[PDB]
Amino acid sequence: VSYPIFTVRWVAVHTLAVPTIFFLGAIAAMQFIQR
């Protein structure tokens, strides 16, 4: 089939995906903040 590349669902799946990873990276960074 000829499925589209950018759909409404893609807008959704990214609004939660992009922030998350951004956070998982930020949060993974704290593990080294000390004193």
Binding site: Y3, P4, I5, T7, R9, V18, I21, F22, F23, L24, G25, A26, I27, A28, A29, M30, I33, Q34, R35
Partner: protein
């Protein structure tokens, strides 16, 4: 029933997908890592750095005590922090 639009099983399996994301994902991960790493996060969200809760003494908590003049109050609170 009615099954529409680009499927996930396929998309996850698509070589193009990882081509595209094996840049984006870690990009975000390192982008946020720096958000904390740089100490930017702190300043964005007025969150105290381990060395900024009480100035050497003041075993007293910096508690906002009134709306309206609330902000000016917080400012001076950081002030005292020397």
């Amino acid at each position: 029933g009615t099954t529409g639009e680009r499927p996930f099983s396929d998309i996850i399996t698509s070589v193009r997908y990882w081509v595209i994301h094996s840049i984006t994902i870690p990009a975000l991960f390192i982008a946020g890592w720096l958000f904390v790493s740089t100490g930017l996060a702190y300043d964005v969200f007025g969150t105290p750095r381990p060395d900024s809760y009480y100035a050497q003494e003041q075993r007293s908590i910096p508690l906002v005590t009134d709306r309206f003049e609330a902000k000016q109050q917080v400012e001076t609170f950081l002030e005292q922090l020397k």
